[PDB]
Design a protein around this ligand. Structure first.
Ligand SMILES: [Br-]
Ligand SMILES: [Br-]
Ligand SMILES: [Br-]
Ligand SMILES: [Br-]
Length: 93
């Protein structure tokens, strides 16, 4: 049930889907000094978080999406000094 999106700089998407959580992941092709995620649920307010780094990947757990919840998410990632921001991706729980 997870989703992946690919760009030469990254694979990113949703993984780790359980009844009470999903994980937004961002796996860059070049090591990043930091990655932020921007998210909204059912078109609510935008929330911004520094992702957690683990083994060269970056993660954010989103808890308590009910079935039918729409999660929209974008990233700002560092690469070799500057940072870059993606489009908004969509996931339906
Ligand atoms: Br893909
Ligand atoms: Br690298
Ligand atoms: Br944060
Ligand atoms: Br967009």
């Amino acid at each position: 049930n997870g989703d992946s999106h690919t760009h030469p700089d990254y694979t990113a998407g949703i993984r780790g889907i359980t009844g009470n959580e999903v994980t937004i992941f961002f796996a860059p092709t070049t090591e990043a000094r930091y990655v932020d995620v921007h998210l909204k649920v059912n078109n609510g307010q935008q929330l911004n978080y520094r992702m957690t780094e683990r083994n060269g990947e970056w993660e954010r757990v989103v808890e308590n999406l009910s079935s039918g919840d729409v999660l929209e998410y974008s990233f700002t990632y560092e690469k070799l000094g500057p940072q870059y921001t993606t489009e908004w991706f969509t996931y339906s729980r």
